[model samples]
Structures are given as C-alpha cells and as structure tokens.
Target: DLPAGWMRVQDTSGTYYWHIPTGTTQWEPP
Candidate 1:
C-alpha cells in the first residue's frame, strides 16, 4: 500500500513505477 498523493504506473516495458506527489517518477515504491 502507498500513502496518499502517490500513484502507480506501468511503463511501456511492462515495469511498474511510482508517481510521487512531488512530481517525480521512481522505479521503487515510496
């Protein structure tokens, strides 16, 4: 589970990334 303001996305390569409230994308959960 993630905190509020955080989102999960799937890239073209079928990888999951985290979209943070800070407007940043990371390969790990935050």
Candidate 2:
C-alpha cells in the first residue's frame, strides 16, 4: 500500500525513460 499522494515507477531494463508529474513523488522500494 502507498500513501495518498505517493507513486512508484520502475524500469526493468535500465534503458527506459521514467518521469513523474509535477506534483507527484516516487517512493522507495521495500
């Protein structure tokens, strides 16, 4: 589960481009 305004993004290949919206944030992996 995540907090109200938190998000999670990942790139399995390490070559993909990732981004977050202006008001969003990425959380640390567990």
Candidate 3:
C-alpha cells in the first residue's frame, strides 16, 4: 500500500500518476 497522503490517479490518457501531499505529481510509483 502507498504511504499516507500519497495516491495513484489516472490522467486523461488513462495513465497512472503518483500524487503526493507535497504538491508533486509524477508518473513513477510513489
């Protein structure tokens, strides 16, 4: 499981992006 405040979300292209509470977004795993 991911750490607190971290989440996996999909973009319009259906690709997963790693979202964090630190205001960062990336395509790599968090």
Candidate 4:
C-alpha cells in the first residue's frame, strides 16, 4: 500500500492518479 499524500504513477496510455483522500486510485483520462 502507498502512503497518503504520495502516489504511485505509471506512463501507459496517459493515465495517472494518486492516493489522496482515499486509499484506492483512479486513472485519469488523457
């Protein structure tokens, strides 16, 4: 699990998200 205020990111199809306010992350649209 990732720490709050920090995020795990990846560069695939222009999707990125963070772990803030919630534990689960959602990939945003490009």
lDDT of 1 by residue, 1-30 (tens): 877877778767765555565787777877
Alpha-carbon local distance difference test for all models: 0.71, 0.42, 0.70, 0.60
Error of 1 at 9 (Å): 0.3
Name the best candidate (by lDDT).
Answer: 1
User: Candidate 4, residue 17: CA error in Å?
Assistant: 10
- Which model, 2 or 3, shows the larger lDDT? 3
Give TM per candidate: 0.54, 0.32, 0.49, 0.29
3 against 4, candidate with superior TM-score = 3
Candidate 2 residue lDDT tens string, 1-30: 644444555567333222334553334432
TM-score of 2: 0.32
Clashing pairs in 3: none
Ten-residue stretch with the least lDDT total in model 3: 13-22
**True-structure lDDT of candidate 4:** 0.60
lDDT of 3 by residue, 1-30 (tens): 876787878767765656465777776776
Winner by TM-score between candidate 4 and candidate 1: 1
TM-score of 4: 0.29
Q: In terms of TM-score, how similar is model 3 to the real structure?
A: 0.49
